[PDB]
Scaffold this motif. Structure first.
Motif, PDB file in Angstrom:
ATOM      1  N   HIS C  43       0.802  -1.206   0.000  1.00 48.57           N
ATOM      2  CA  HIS C  43       0.000   0.000   0.000  1.00 48.57           C
ATOM      3  C   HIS C  43       0.835   1.256   0.000  1.00 48.57           C
ATOM      4  N   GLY C  44       2.141   1.135   0.062  1.00 51.15           N
ATOM      5  CA  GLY C  44       3.011   2.258  -0.147  1.00 51.15           C
ATOM      6  C   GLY C  44       3.553   2.902   1.096  1.00 51.15           C
ATOM      7  N   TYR C  45       3.146   2.462   2.285  1.00 50.21           N
ATOM      8  CA  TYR C  45       3.513   3.190   3.490  1.00 50.21           C
ATOM      9  C   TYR C  45       4.979   3.044   3.837  1.00 50.21           C
ATOM     10  N   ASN C  65       9.460   6.002   3.990  1.00 52.63           N
ATOM     11  CA  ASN C  65       9.410   7.109   3.050  1.00 52.63           C
ATOM     12  C   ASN C  65       9.163   8.456   3.689  1.00 52.63           C
ATOM     13  N   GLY C  66       7.901   8.818   3.824  1.00 50.56           N
ATOM     14  CA  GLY C  66       7.543  10.043   4.479  1.00 50.56           C
ATOM     15  C   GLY C  66       6.110   9.978   4.906  1.00 50.56           C
ATOM     16  N   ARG C  67       5.485   8.825   4.738  1.00 51.26           N
ATOM     17  CA  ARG C  67       4.047   8.762   4.619  1.00 51.26           C
ATOM     18  C   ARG C  67       3.337   8.149   5.799  1.00 51.26           C
ATOM     19  N   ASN C  69       1.800   8.265   9.459  1.00 53.29           N
ATOM     20  CA  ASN C  69       1.498   9.060  10.626  1.00 53.29           C
ATOM     21  C   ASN C  69       1.620   8.224  11.888  1.00 53.29           C
ATOM     22  N   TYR C 129      -2.174   3.866   9.457  1.00 55.01           N
ATOM     23  CA  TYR C 129      -2.413   5.020   8.610  1.00 55.01           C
ATOM     24  C   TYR C 129      -1.211   5.939   8.713  1.00 55.01           C
TER      25      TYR C 129
END
Lengths: 87, 217, 129, 62, 206, 125
Positions: C43-45, C65-67, C69, C129
RNA sequence: UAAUCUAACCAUAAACUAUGCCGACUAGGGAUCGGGUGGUGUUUUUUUAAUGACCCACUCGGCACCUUACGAGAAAUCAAAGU
């Protein structure tokens, strides 16, 4: 963000940082943005061209700013042999 | 008249900036209240609380008057300031000017599906100041605003139609309550949602595209 | 003493992404660490990761990455029925259109949309998330 | 969606509101009832529909 | 993306090692540890001069990329720098600041000393931080002349020097001032040496 | 028993900033001047204002100002040879044409690999 | 890895109190106390190798101390009273 029809319906999309991919809001009053100058074949500078870097508010306060410059700049060929991955 | 004395002010007096978003994209500092008035002519205020307050200088009880003033649009921009002064009608007009100076946007999103305009908040948010906490929550259509009256009146002037609140802490010092709902709005641009994941290149400032203009003599 | 291995293998991550780093080092690894990671990776996290082994139970080095929280764990792994996913999901997650809670379910470890269209349910494991 | 309780109890609630004339005939979608208002029923009483249809000179003559 | 004319001249570094500018202080801090070549058995550490020149052409690539050459400000408060800033700002056009910085001069536009620059160049950010701290409020990038006892907060591209000697403070302004003119086109050829004596930028008291 | 109030002190340095080439170290001349370039209401206040400017003006013939002064703009631009030496202090000719360095710093230049006429000495401690 | 080791005194010390306690992670700074590994550095001298003391650098464990604060707090303050 965009509706059923398709048009964008934010106010206006904001600027991501470039060292840590955060997001820089309208009260991050230490959010520096820095240009450098492209060079000419004779050795002069083009007056109109840039390379742009955006650094967040908090990579500067801890002091991790300049190393994050050297990491970022050296990927774009500006420097050579001043930063090293395997520390 | 109006003499701009700050170099942002000359750029907007000459009309090189047409919307307020160029102040917000490059996050520029603002220090002259006439800039907002030409930029956002629809701005509009109310006064929340006026309270006499006292200082025992020389055992002479001189009266001040603290005022809490919120200004705001009915599209997505708000503002809030507080000022004490010796006379009543000076404290209101001085209280407006700080509130004109502190304007912020607000990301307004949906609840669920995607029909038409945005009404509610994008996510849930929270700000705390002093000892109060205030937390804002998305709602379906028809909900309206459920808050205290002093906080429902704030969110009308930012133009959110439906939202759900929940507040902890001693909510009976209203100078501190409103200073928490304010933080809890202005964070809405700042939560990186997944549609904001994509990449864009950096734009360049107006403060050096028009650099020959807006320069002192 | 050390009771849950996963619970501080996700406490090591966001504790070193609140400070904006790019990589972390996990110790020990597990069969249920890796599959929790492999669902935050499709999912890219997170980015990619490597598995050391040193003949005891390996370490892991992850690339962030940066994503993110927040990513977390729910510690009595309770027993989610099938009519009760949507009460767990209305409480843990910030908005109705993103984020995921993941489950250990009799046909593998998966997220909560993926468990809807396979029509299964199980025990809770965490969120992301 | 495509859940057979949404389709049986939805398309009946929609069908009853149009049949008395509160929902607009182009607003036959389930999200549109969540922004209905309180005078959209008040304009269908007999006290209001006889004054508009030209029988009484005022709303108190209805 | 910078040709061999931008390489380090063997004649140029002959000055620097003569100027004793490759001797750091005896206590590194944790952020500037890439800049240290090796420690001497005496107790001092040797800066990597090939690094201090590679991060010298970068600052001039920022200073040359500004429209109006009076938006740079160069500050010192030590005695050893406050000649060298003047002759720098003399024939480049920056607005120099020497001696005392008055507080609240980048905010509070009702002062007469009010300025709104585009860069700030400081020498010694330990004993100078009022210009550092105020620039943090109003989005002003900054460049420093860092020693190895230098609190490198808020500070971008950072020239490693020796902020103890008198030649070594002055010389880095001079080589910076030499390089910024070459980029503007105000000179003619990289390979020709500078006509001005570098001892002009120094400081002397009777 | 006589120090000068700020309204003497302040306006004395405003007048010295707008008409500096016109002023003069003698008091009796520029007594006749301040009435021309400024408006002084009384007479004794004029006598006090011009009194301390001339006392301020002889500081200029010894040191610098706390206003602005174009000797900075021109005679400190004549101070571009405070002492320019005819041969530099940074000249290797003072060191017999050879650079005197420590031991291991010679490996720094050999690391970047350059050909310099340097010598090497012995170090203590 | 869990049954609850002269005497007696009168309170005449703001008489500092929502700390299984074990575990992981998160910024600097120098002094000192134990154990260990290093070194062309010293010097008692056996000799400027070494025993021998020093000295320097790292290292695992200790009671303390000074900074800042992204953080936390009603505040005073706190490297945990943080995550």
């Amino acid at each position: 963000m965009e509706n059923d029809k398709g048009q964008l319906v934010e106010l206006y999309v904001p600027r991501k940082c470039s060292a840590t991919n955060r997001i820089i809001k309208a009260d991050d009053h230490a959010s520096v943005q820095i240009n450098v100058a492209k060079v000419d074949e004779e050795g002069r500078a083009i007056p109109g061209e840039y390379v742009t870097y955006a650094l967040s508010g908090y990579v500067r306060s801890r002091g991790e700013s300049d190393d994050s410059l050297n990491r970022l700049a050296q990927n774009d060929g500006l420097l050579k042999n001043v930063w090293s991955y395997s520390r | 008249g109006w003499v701009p004395v700050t170099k942002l002010g000359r750029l907007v007096k000459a009309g090189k900036i047409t919307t307020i978003e160029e102040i917000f994209l490059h996050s520029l500092p603002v220090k002259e209240f006439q800039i907002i008035d030409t930029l956002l002519p629809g701005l509009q205020d109310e006064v929340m609380n006026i309270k006499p307050v006292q200082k025992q200088t020389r055992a002479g009880q001189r009266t001040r008057f603290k005022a809490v003033v919120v200004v705001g649009d009915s599209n997505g921009h708000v503002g809030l300031g507080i000022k004490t002064a010796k006379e009543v009608a000076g404290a209101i007009r001085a209280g407006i000017i700080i509130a004109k100076l502190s304007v912020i946007p607000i990301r307004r999103g949906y609840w669920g599906t995607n029909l038409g305009q945005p009404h509610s908040l994008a996510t849930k948010t929270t700000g705390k100041c002093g000892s109060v906490t205030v937390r804002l929550i998305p709602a379906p259509r028809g909900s309206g605003i459920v808050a205290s009256p002093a906080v429902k009146k704030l969110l009308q002037l930012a133009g959110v139609e439906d939202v759900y609140t929940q507040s902890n802490g001693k909510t009976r010092t209203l100078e501190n309550t409103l200073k928490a709902a304010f933080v809890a709005i202005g964070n809405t641009y700042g939560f990186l949602t997944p549609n904001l994941w994509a990449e864009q290149p950096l734009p360049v400032s107006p403060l050096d595209i028009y650099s020959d203009e807006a320069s002192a003599q | 003493t050390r009771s849950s291995v996963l619970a501080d293998a996700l406490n090591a991550i966001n504790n070193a992404e609140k400070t904006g780093k790019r990589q972390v080092l996990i110790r020990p690894s597990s069969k249920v660490i890796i599959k929790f990671l492999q669902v935050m990776q499709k999912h890219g996290y997170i980015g990619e990761f490597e598995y050391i082994d040193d003949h005891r139970s390996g370490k892991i080095v992850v690339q962030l990455n940066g994503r993110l929280n927040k990513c977390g764990v729910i510690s009595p792994r309770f027993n989610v029925k099938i009519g009760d996913i949507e009460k767990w999901t209305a409480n843990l997650l910030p908005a109705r259109q993103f984020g995921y809670v993941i489950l250990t379910t009799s046909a593998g470890i998966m997220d909560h949309e993926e468990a809807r269209r396979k029509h299964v349910s199980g025990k809770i494991l965490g969120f992301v998330y | 969606e495509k859940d057979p309780k949404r389709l049986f109890e939805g398309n009946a609630l929609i069908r009853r509101l149009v049949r008395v004339g509160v929902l607009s005939e182009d607003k036959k979608k389930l999200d549109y009832v969540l922004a209905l208002k309180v005078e959209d029923f008040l304009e269908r009483r007999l006290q209001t529909q006889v004054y508009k249809l030209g029988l009484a000179k005022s709303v108190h003559h209805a | 993306s910078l040709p061999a004319t931008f390489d380090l001249t063997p004649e140029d570094a002959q000055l620097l090692l003569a100027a004793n500018t490759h001797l750091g202080a005896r206590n590194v801090q944790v952020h500037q540890e890439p800049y240290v070549f090796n420690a001497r058995p005496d107790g001092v550490h040797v800066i990597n001069v090939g690094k201090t020149w590679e991060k010298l052409v970068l600052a001039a690539r920022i200073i040359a990329a500004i429209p109006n050459p009076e938006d740079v400000v160069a500050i010192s408060s030590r005695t050893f720098g406050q000649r060298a800033v003047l002759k720098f700002a003399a024939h480049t056009g920056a607005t120099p600041i020497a001696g005392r910085f008055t507080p609240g001069s980048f905010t509070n536009y009702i002062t007469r000393s009010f300025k709104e620059p585009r860069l700030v160049i400081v020498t010694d950010p330990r004993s100078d931080a009022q210009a550092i701290k105020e620039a943090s409020y109003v989005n002003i990038p900054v460049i420093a002349l860092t020693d190895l006892d230098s609190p490198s907060e808020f500070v971008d591209v950072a020239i490693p020097c020796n902020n103890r000697g008198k030649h070594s403070i002055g010389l880095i302004w001079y080589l910076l001032a030499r390089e910024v003119l070459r980029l503007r086109g105000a000179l003619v050829d990289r390979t020709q040496p500078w006509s001005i004596m570098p001892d002009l930028y120094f400081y002397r008291f009777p | 028993g006589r120090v000068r109030t700020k309204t003497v002190k302040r306006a004395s340095k405003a007048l010295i900033e707008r008409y500096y080439p016109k002023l003069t170290l003698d008091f009796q001349t520029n007594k006749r001047l301040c009435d021309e370039i400024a408006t002084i209401q009384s007479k004794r206040l004029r006598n006090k204002i011009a009194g301390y400017t001339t006392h301020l003006m002889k500081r200029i013939q010894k040191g610098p100002v706390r206003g602005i002064s174009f000797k900075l703009q021109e005679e400190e631009r004549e101070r571009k040879d405070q002492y320019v030496p005819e041969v530099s202090a940074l000249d290797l000719s003072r060191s017999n044409g050879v650079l005197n360095v420590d031991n291991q710093t010679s490996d720094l230049v050999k690391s970047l690999g350059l050909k310099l006429p340097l010598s090497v000495i012995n170090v203590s401690a």
